[PDB]
Enzyme design. Sequence first.
Site, PDB file in Angstrom:
ATOM      1  N   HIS A  13       0.850  -1.196   0.000  1.00 35.68           N
ATOM      2  CA  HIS A  13       0.000   0.000   0.000  1.00 35.68           C
ATOM      3  C   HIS A  13       0.882   1.242   0.000  1.00 35.68           C
ATOM      4  CE1 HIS A  13       0.408   2.107   3.874  1.00 35.68           C
ATOM      5  NE2 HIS A  13       0.710   0.928   4.381  1.00 35.68           N
ATOM      6  N   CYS A  14       0.309   2.369  -0.398  1.00 31.52           N
ATOM      7  CA  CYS A  14       1.047   3.625  -0.342  1.00 31.52           C
ATOM      8  C   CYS A  14       0.142   4.683   0.277  1.00 31.52           C
ATOM      9  CB  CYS A  14       1.631   4.034  -1.655  1.00 31.52           C
ATOM     10  SG  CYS A  14       0.594   3.897  -3.114  1.00 31.52           S
ATOM     11  N   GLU A  15       0.127   5.879  -0.291  1.00 26.70           N
ATOM     12  CA  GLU A  15      -0.717   6.937   0.236  1.00 26.70           C
ATOM     13  C   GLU A  15      -2.155   6.792  -0.256  1.00 26.70           C
ATOM     14  OE1 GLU A  15       0.599  10.933  -0.428  1.00 26.70           O
ATOM     15  OE2 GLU A  15      -0.822  11.743   1.044  1.00 26.70           O
TER      16      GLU A  15
END
Length: 177
Positions: A99-101
């Site tokens: 996952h990221c932002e």
Amino acid sequence: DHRELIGDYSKAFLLQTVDGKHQDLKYISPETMVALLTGKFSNIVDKFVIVDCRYPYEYEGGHIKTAVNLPLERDAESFLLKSPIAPCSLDKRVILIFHCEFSSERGPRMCRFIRERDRAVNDYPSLYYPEMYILKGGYKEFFPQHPNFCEPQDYRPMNHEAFKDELKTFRLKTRSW
Ligand code: MMC
Ligand SMILES: [Cl-]
């Protein structure tokens, strides 16, 4: 199960998936993320690694408990593929969640990269990581819903106005632009 089998064609995906921008990737909701963290699948899942692909300042600002920060392709390769993470039991599984932002660019790319290297170093169709998911919505969607699963309980956006220099510095560390 109504979907295809996982990466090495040994069995089906364990988790329920939702729809996401990249049509060929598997996305899970924040709800399913809390299910794993609370041990709902402890009978079956031996280990699940949460890979936060955000830049270091962002992670330091608040991340999901237990997650590891692996922003650079190289670090990820080193952490995951030099000495693969194996289940303690033949029966149990190993699962990776990226996952990221926003889980829009960084996370999906990292997922695709690790898959490329897993294929590259094994005899088809074995994989060290046949089952990989993206957390839909990224940290941005996760924090406001399950804050007590985050440490510190805060959120620092990549575009945070006071970390402009750190963003530039960080990008000059990347394999490529
Ligand atoms: C494909 Hg990740
Ligand atoms: Cl890189």
